[PDB]
Structure 1
Amino acid sequence: DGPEKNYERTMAILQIEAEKAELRLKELEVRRLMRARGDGPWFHYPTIDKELIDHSPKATPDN
Structure 2
Amino acid sequence: DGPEKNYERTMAILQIEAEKAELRLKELEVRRLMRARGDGPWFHYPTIDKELIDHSPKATPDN
* TM norm structure 2: 0.99
Structure 1: distance between partners of 2:59 and 2:50: 21
Displacement of 1:40 after TM fit? 0.3
For residues 17-48 of structure 1, the C-alpha deviation after alignment (integer angstroms, 9 at most, x for no partner) is: 00000000000000000000000000000000
Query: In angstroms, what is the RMSD of aligned CA positions?
Result: 0.2
Structure 2: distance between partners of 1:2 and 1:51: 68
Displacement of 1:49 after TM fit? 0.2
Structure 2: distance between partners of 1:42 and 1:34: 6
Stretches of structure 1 that go unaligned for 5 or more consecutive residues are none
* TM norm structure 1: 0.99
Stretches of structure 2 that go unaligned for 5 or more consecutive residues are none
Tell me the secondary structure at the aligned position of residue 27 of structure 2: helix
Give the aligned length: 63
Percent identity between matched residues is 100
